[PDB]
Write a protein that binds this ligand. Sequence first.
Ligand SMILES: [Cl-]
Ligand SMILES: [Mg+2]
Lengths: 195, 235, 231, 250, 240, 111, 244, 241, 243
Amino acid sequence: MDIILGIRVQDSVILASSKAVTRGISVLKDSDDKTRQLSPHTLMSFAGEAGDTVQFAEYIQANIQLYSIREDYELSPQAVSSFVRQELAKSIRSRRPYQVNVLIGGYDKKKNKPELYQIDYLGTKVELPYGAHGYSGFYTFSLLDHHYRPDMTTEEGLDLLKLCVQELEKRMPMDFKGVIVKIVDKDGIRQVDDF
Amino acid sequence: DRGVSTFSPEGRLFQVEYSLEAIKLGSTAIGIATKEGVVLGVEKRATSPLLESDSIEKIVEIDRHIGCAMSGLTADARSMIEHARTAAVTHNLYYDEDINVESLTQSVCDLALRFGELMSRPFGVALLIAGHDADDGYQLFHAEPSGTFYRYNAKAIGSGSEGAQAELLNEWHSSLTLKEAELLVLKILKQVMEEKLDENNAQLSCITKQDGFKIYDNEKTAELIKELKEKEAAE
Amino acid sequence: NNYDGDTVTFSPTGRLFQVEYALEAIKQGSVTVGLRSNTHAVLVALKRNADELSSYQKKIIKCDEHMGLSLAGLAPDARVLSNYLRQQCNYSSLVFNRKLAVERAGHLLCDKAQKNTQSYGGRPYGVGLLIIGYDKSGAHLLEFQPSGNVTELYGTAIGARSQGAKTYLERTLDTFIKIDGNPDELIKAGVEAISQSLRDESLTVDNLSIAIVGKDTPFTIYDGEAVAKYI
Amino acid sequence: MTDRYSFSLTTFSPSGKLGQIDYALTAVKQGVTSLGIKATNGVVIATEKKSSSPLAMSETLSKVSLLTPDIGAVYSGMGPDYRVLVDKSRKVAHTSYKRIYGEYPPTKLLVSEVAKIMQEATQSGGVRPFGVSLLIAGHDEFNGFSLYQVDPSGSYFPWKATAIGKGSVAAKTFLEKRWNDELELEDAIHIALLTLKESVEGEFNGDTIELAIIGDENPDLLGYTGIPTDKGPRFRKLTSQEINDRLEAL
Amino acid sequence: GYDRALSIFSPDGHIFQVEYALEAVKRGTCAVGVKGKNCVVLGCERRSTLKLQDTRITPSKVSKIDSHVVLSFSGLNADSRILIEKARVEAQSHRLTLEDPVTVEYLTRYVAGVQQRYTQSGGVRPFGVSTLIAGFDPRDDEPKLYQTEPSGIYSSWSAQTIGRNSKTVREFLEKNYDRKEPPATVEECVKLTVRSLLEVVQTGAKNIEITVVKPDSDIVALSSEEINQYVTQIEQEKQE
Amino acid sequence: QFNPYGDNGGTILGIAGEDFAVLAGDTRNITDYSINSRYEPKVFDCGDNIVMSANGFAADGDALVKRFKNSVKWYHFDHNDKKLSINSAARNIQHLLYGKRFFPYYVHTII
Amino acid sequence: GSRRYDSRTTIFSPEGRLYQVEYALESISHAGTAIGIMASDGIVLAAERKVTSTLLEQDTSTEKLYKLNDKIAVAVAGLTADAEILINTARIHAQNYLKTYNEDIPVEILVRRLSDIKQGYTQHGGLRPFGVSFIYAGYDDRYGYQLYTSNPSGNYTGWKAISVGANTSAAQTLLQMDYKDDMKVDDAIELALKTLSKTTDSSALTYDRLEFATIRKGANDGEVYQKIFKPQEIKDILVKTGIT
Amino acid sequence: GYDRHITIFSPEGRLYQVEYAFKATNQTNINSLAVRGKDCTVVISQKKVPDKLLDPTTVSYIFCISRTIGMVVNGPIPDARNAALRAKAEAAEFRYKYGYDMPCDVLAKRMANLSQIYTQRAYMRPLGVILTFVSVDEELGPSIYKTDPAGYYVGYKATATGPKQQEITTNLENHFKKSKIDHINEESWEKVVEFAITHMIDALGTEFSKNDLEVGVATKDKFFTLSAENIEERLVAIAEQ
Amino acid sequence: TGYDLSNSVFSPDGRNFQVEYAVKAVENGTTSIGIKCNDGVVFAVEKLITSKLLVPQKNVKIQVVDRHIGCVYSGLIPDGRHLVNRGREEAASFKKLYKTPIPIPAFADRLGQYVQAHTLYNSVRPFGVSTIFGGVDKNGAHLYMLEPSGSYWGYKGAATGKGRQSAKAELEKLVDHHPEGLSAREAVKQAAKIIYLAHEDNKEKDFELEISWCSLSETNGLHKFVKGDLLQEAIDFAQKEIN
Ligand SMILES: [Cl-]
Ligand SMILES: [Mg+2]
């Protein structure tokens, strides 16, 4: 875990998530996908304590999938984000809290608008044009403050994302073995294979 | 009404005796024990021709060395089998060995009387538990909802039980081969069954030390049925 | 009649019919005999089979190295009670490094059976037991009934036609009590006692079941070819 | 041991009747008459003090009970069932309201809580319904004065004026003739005493009649001074002397 | 807690509460399942004593348990929701631990186990519901159709019907369904299903529901006009 | 603060032959620099030709042996006087020990 | 023991019916009639109060019509006390959903859960079922305007127009006759009152014996308004349609 | 007719088990009486010891609940003792929780509320007893409060309980008509006990020896029972007047 | 009717028929007695010798509670044991909290409340025993008799079982003839006689006598069984009186 980014543009939400899984002085894997599809138009990336991350991601995934089957309907990104926030808000006062930070990128089909939510392990939710968790934000936020425009295309958003990854690869201490990039729009979720 | 765990004036538990009547309504199941193995056979009894008969699962594996056949309210047997399987595997985990067939049966029979006012009623199903262990060799047990189990050389349960048991009385001897026992189950099943016996409405199985518990294919049983008919016509 | 629906109800004459119906299950059970001298205590049990293809229902259960019983009635209830005895015998050993007295064994069974006769929902035990044992005060023989009543005896018998063996032992009392330091002769007396309860059937090799405990003899059960000596 | 009665003792009969509720209402019918009348500037509740024995001190037995400083209750039916309901009603006013909002509940909501308790005795395991009908009079800032009736079923209805118990049928007819929407509190007390005389048979005075009002705030009954917003209880029980004064000009 | 043993044996060896639950199933609207060569079709009756209904929002008779398995039923409607909910939860729980969706056999075995538990648990009555569970196992093109009932027994069927007048439609299917050659196409399977319901239903208007399930989570419900075309076609061939 | 463990010292040794096996152990019991007993046995015959010793903290060692001896007893009751094989005894003891994984028996056990 | 006195509320008849559910429905058939009519631009709820007394306070009274949230209301038919237990549960459930998802609860979801509660009382617990039938009238952004009913069995269904309580047979026939799909709210108001006026057991239908409510999008732009009619407003609407 | 076996309503709105519990009250065939003085409250009860083998000192239906409160029971002794033990526990707990001695009338209410529960809850039967509580309350003065199986309770100027209760009741009624006051206008408790015995003798029409009576007296800060000799001394005083 | 089918149900009389039915079971049982004496109490019981096969002196019916209380009962023997087991728990918790051994009157109420509790619910059965018990405490000697209803009183002499009326009559004579008091050693001898006299109502089977006693002087305030020479002496005294 470590680097998870998110950028909301005109017609889509783009999530970038590092591929490295490190334990001790060994990079155990360099192709790890730190994300789960909660519903056809909602994607959640995650980062934090080992084990907790996936266990939480999959638990949320199961619940949203259960809801979808029960009501034969897809929950809005806003609704999913609120559900996730509450689960974390419960967790923090538990015996052993989930130490997991997430980004929820979704496309609301009723509003025809992309939405990006940033939620930390405390259950602190914020809707943002761009978001990051961990040390990443200390570089990317200022970079995006400068280069981001609200009316950008998906292609422009990917170039803007490339600029972030380049900066992180230059100034971050750890080798995070690149990122997996996924786009969330009106047509659902797809992965960019060449990044 | 009246209590579930009530004794009759003759000194029997009403509910246990009534569950025995339910088992008499069930389909026939036969077991025969030999020195070469133990054979288990059942009547499938499909309620309609549209029902896919191969989905009727009345013979069941508990462990590699223990098999089980059922008769009566077969839905009730699911939790009994589950318990048997867990008991067998759990014993292997705790002791690094196979569990004795008698010990397994005893564990299943402990559930039987755990009912009252625990579950609400006794089981409505009887089990034939067949297996092998190193100590007492090939064994066949009849487990009832009374909590009682008897070892048998051969045993029939279900609707055609009393007629089949009398037939097993004459036919069984201590030097039966496995092949002889297979035919004997098929013979006796064909006698007590309503519909005509074939590979689709009857199922065979066995447990041997070497190969463990095996349910026979419909192709294999069909050849044993054909072998049986030829031998009866031959004299 | 109207007062036999459950164990919590007394009859107008002060009877507990469910307890009496449980007592009736014992009378249906196969005969078993108990007797002792001053050195040894012996259980002799007639085992019963479903048919010629079936095995013979095991009647005798070991509780500890120095104690055990024979049963007559519902076998699962005997398994529950014998298990309880095993635990109580074992508790006495682990905690106090003390072999459980046969008298206390009886007291514990009495109190366990009683609780089932005073509460709604439950039922009485449907089995009678004959407990033998050798403890610090010599050989013992107990008779347990599921009413709760436990009784210490020189000899007794329970089950179907148990009156025949019980009469014999009542005559033989003076003889068998002084069979000290001789196991085989005390068993012979027990085998002759149970024979008085036989009708049409006789004692065969896989029919008879004998158990013995004594001064220098742990509780051991004899079945199969080991009892051929006494036929 | 233990409560084995975990099943309903009140069930639907083939005709659709809930037997125990009907029978509870029959018990209420047998009970002594009580009534309530709503005025423009107050509410009055009244009942007869049926003495079990002349040696008994009827002052110690209070049929009209304060629930909150602005809410009072009276009943017809089984007294013991009423007494415990008053205990539970007083407590629920604190636990489910005052300890949360820092103020007393409005009449309608306290009534609602009492109704809930009585409904549960109609459905819960191993219990019979309460054998009483309550008349609850009260005041609150935003609803003003109000009067409610609560039946064994747990149903409650708001009334301008009504009566329950022994001679309720005749008493309700009497109240229909006399009641108007311009009644002052003193006029309602006068009518209450007239209505009650019809049902009472023996002695009719301040010692055999129990009567309380929900009217103006009573600073003299508050017990302390210094807080301007706290002006005292609107519930006041009329004294034996105060009743007799009005019985002369009857 | 309420402990009473409601489901108990009778002198003749019957559990009346389980058998009375079957009567509730017999009262329920007819439901039929027919599996073809490459598909399964679930047909369902809807009683026409209810006009002024709102079919948009009214609970549909066929329910999706997962994207690849469906469940229809006959009997008490309120009871069916409880089974469907439990099944749906177990479906997601199976995906979570095994990392693979349920097989139709497994899902059926679970639902049947729940029904059985309610026949020997204290304080509860059995489910007055029999179900038809149909679908396709993951990465498998062999059609699956299973039936469950209040007792807890379950089994696989080439074709089967449950509910009121089911014995009439079972009679129809028994002669019209060939084991050696099942309905080769979707059209053939739907037609045979509609035909079988037309023996019992009344009118082929808003009384018949049809749901077609195909491999790889391909489930679609037919509309009124689509079903009406089968009804119109069958009646014209009948007049002969 | 109360310390629930102690060290009773001693040492044990087991060797296996072709048709035999030995399990030896010194008879000294100690706490700190004092001797408690010069003859306190800690190698026991547990039945079914199994000898056992649990060396380290004697209170935990005696408890474990006691439990295993009791395990042998109940194995007989529950499985028709079957002899507990050495391999089966080993696996049983694993479970006894691991049952107290989060409050261990401070012993090195040999059978 | 106590077995002797157990009614066994959650069992099947030999015919496969639930005794207590059937008898609860028999109870509900004597309760005051409640009608729900769904129009294209709103929903009407109309209900007849049970034999009113002249000294009953009418304006500060609530017997038939209850508010569950800002978008959903119910009409009651049966035991009021039972209905209030279920209504508070429903009100809480709606707030739980809103707290969890930050969205108003879809009508069906609320209905299903309330119906599931009723179902439980018929299958386990040994308690009597709730002697209540609801008409749910509500709106959400998925299905728009919706009418549902639930009964003591825990079974619920959707409707264009429906009646519960007394004389449903006669009421349903009249609704089935005059109802059509392109109907407006003001027309549905008139239909609801006309149906009650003919099916009533009373001599004449008056304002004091009625509860009335509408759920329109008659607020300002793309938002729903609940209107629980006041006594004077029922008096006026009764004159306007020419019943009095 | 199972509505007569448990505490549920009959068609005419009655609880038969409660009514039958009232009849259990008189099973002992003992009459009790309670009156108030200026400074005291006196309670007296008949004492009948039929068996010669009984230890007469252990035969009692009067109980010392707390230091200040006394209680006499009309009904079978098992239920009487059940009620006594509970009342003792309640009075002790009250003092611990609220820091002052439980008043007579409050204990009566508490025991009455418990009795009420048995009339509503099915698994619990009512106690077949009538509990008469007496004290000299520090706020209300001399106090008599009585409880029954229905859960009813009320204060009394004076009271009587038992088979011949009505004869005793009217006897007392006529006295208070005559005296025109709520109590026995007497200084010492000795003479109030004498009044109680005198008016019981007149009402019942029987003469009493020292062993035929049982007396309890409540004064400020203590309730106590009288011995046989204390009663004998009291009987002598009546006879010599 | 049906008022007698369920425990804790009042009949129209105000009676609990189930308790009265339990009394019948007590009346069916063997005879047991209790005699209060100068500085203690004596207990005795009839043991019917059903068969020659019964081991003499080895079916003990009298039970001890704590170290100073003796209990004996007639009726359903198991029910009596259950009551004693409770008595022992009650006496143990009293001594645990209050240090001093439980007084007899205190102990009497503990059993009384427990037995009475078994008349409050239909889910339990009343006790099928009348229990005679007592001992020596700080206030001296106490004898009690407890019945199925929960009713108990203190006694000068007590008797219950099949021969209760015969024993009661004999007990009443002792109270009359010895107003100053009866000694402990005398009471043991008298107890033997009264059991032998009460055996006339159960004379088919012959019986075995069993006696126990608590006395401040003779047993030092502790409960002991009468055995050996003192037992045979009491048997001979009884044998001489019947002839
Ligand atoms: Cl209270
Ligand atoms: Mg009661």
